[PDB]
Amino acid sequence: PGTVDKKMVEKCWKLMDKVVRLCQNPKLALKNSPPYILDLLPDTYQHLRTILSRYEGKMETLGENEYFRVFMENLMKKTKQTISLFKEGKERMYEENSQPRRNLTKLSLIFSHMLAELKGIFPSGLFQGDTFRITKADAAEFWRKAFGEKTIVPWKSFRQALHEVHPISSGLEAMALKSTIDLTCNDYISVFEFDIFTRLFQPWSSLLRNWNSLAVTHPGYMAFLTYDEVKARLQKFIHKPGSYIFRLSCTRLGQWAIGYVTADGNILQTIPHNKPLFQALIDGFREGFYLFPDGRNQNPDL
Ligand code: NA
């Protein structure tokens, strides 16, 4: 994870420019829906300029920051990947549902997560990794005890530390867990990524069982969708009140949104308030609102 300097930063901007040009091609019909790479990359540029501005005079400090070195390396890696993706996908980049354009969507989410992480760790351009506030108290305690005030830890150490408190049953569960928590796909877990995961799958006391029940095996789980995609999916069940699904939002990391069909044949969306998703779904079934996950007749018991 190499030391960041002007020329690395400038190479980043040159690579980001190339991705921008690639995604401006009109034959992609690139829709504006979040995550929208054409906004994300300028926004990442602006926040990086802000960081560099704050560390004028102190460029040694910034460039030795462990979190920043890993972040910039990952940013260079993902933009190169995006550039390669275009070079080899060739004509299929213009097929809306091709596998190379589903890969572009996937990279677009990662750019979104990376920007969000960078803003959580460098609010206003100043490094605050070591004072980051973890939302759930049992999770904050776990981080502070295993990792102190580290901002980022390699996946292997994170897995080992977490296994001792929340046993992971197999190599396969470990990989699936890595895919859920390692939002930036850089083989590290930041305190920001750990915040998001423990918020989504609280209560801490049953952490991984909540994750299995909500995001591994639940037919209601949609992973990342927009409001509009949720509505369009539930439109097909407007005749079936009680049909519901739940989603993550790339613009509101760490919270759930539930969409459901009303007895009156409308679709409403609710954000779980001061309860875990787990409980909002139990209450929602009890009250007759969340009965048919993705329209299916069998609803998991929680
Ligand atoms: Na990561």
Curated annotation (Swiss-Prot):
Subunit structure, as described in the record: Forms homodimers; IFT20 promotes the formation of stable homodimers. Associates with NCK via its SH3 domain. The phosphorylated C-terminus interacts with CD2AP via its second SH3 domain. Binds to UBE2L3. Interacts with adapters SLA, SLA2 and with the phosphorylated C-terminus of SH2B2. Interacts with EGFR, SYK and ZAP70 via the highly conserved Cbl-N region. Also interacts with SORBS1 and INPPL1/SHIP2. Interacts with phosphorylated LAT2. Interacts with CBLB. Interacts with ALK, AXL, BLK, FGR and FGFR2. (Microbial infection) Interacts with M.tuberculosis LpqN, which influences the balance between intrinsic antibacterial and antiviral defense.
Effect annotated for changing G259E: Abolishes interaction with ZAP70 and EPHB1, but does not affect interaction with SLA. Reduces ubiquitination and therefore proteasomal degradation of SPRED2
UniProt-annotated location(s): Cytoplasm; Cell membrane; Cell projection, Cilium; Golgi apparatus
- The species is Homo sapiens
| Positions of the UniProt region annotated as 4H | 1-128
- Cite the domain annotation text: The RING-type zinc finger domain mediates binding to an E2 ubiquitin-conjugating enzyme. The N-terminus is composed of the phosphotyrosine binding (PTB) domain, a short linker region and the RING-type zinc finger. The PTB domain, which is also called TKB (tyrosine kinase binding) domain, is composed of three different subdomains: a four-helix bundle (4H), a calcium-binding EF hand and a divergent SH2 domain.
Where is the region Sufficient for interaction with EPHB1?
1-302
What superkingdom heads the lineage?
A: Eukaryota
Involvement in disease = Noonan syndrome-like disorder with or without juvenile myelomonocytic leukemia: A syndrome characterized by a phenotype reminiscent of Noonan syndrome. Clinical features are highly variable, including facial dysmorphism, short neck, developmental delay, hyperextensible joints and thorax abnormalities with widely spaced nipples. The facial features consist of triangular face with hypertelorism, large low-set ears, ptosis, and flat nasal bridge. Some patients manifest cardiac defects. Some have an increased risk for certain malignancies, particularly juvenile myelomonocytic leukemia.
Q: What positions does the entry give for 4-O-phospho-L-tyrosine binding?
A: R247
Please give the residue ranges the record annotates as the region SH2-like. Answer: 202-302
Q: State the remark under miscellaneous.
A: This protein has one functional calcium-binding site.
The record's account of how the chain is modified after translation: Phosphorylated on tyrosine residues by ALK, EGFR, SYK, FYN and ZAP70. Phosphorylated on tyrosine residues in response to FLT1 and KIT signaling. Phosphorylated on tyrosine residues by INSR and FGR. Phosphorylated on several tyrosine residues by constitutively activated FGFR3. Phosphorylated on tyrosine residues by activated CSF1R, PDGFRA and PDGFRB. Phosphorylated on tyrosine residues by HCK. Ubiquitinated, leading to its degradation via the proteasome. Ubiquitination is negatively regulated by IFT20.
Per the database record, which ranges form the Cbl-PTB domain?
Answer: 1-302
Q: Which residues of the full protein are shown?
A: 48 to 349 of 906
| The protein, known as | E3 ubiquitin-protein ligase CBL
Sequence segments annotated as region (EF-hand-like): 129-201
Q: Which residues bind Ca(2+)?
A: D182, T184, N186, Y188, E193
**Its biological purpose:** E3 ubiquitin-protein ligase that acts as a negative regulator of many signaling pathways by mediating ubiquitination of cell surface receptors. Accepts ubiquitin from specific E2 ubiquitin-conjugating enzymes, and then transfers it to substrates promoting their degradation by the proteasome. Recognizes activated receptor tyrosine kinases, including KIT, FLT1, FGFR1, FGFR2, PDGFRA, PDGFRB, CSF1R, EPHA8 and KDR and mediates their ubiquitination to terminate signaling. Recognizes membrane-bound HCK, SRC and other kinases of the SRC family and mediates their ubiquitination and degradation.
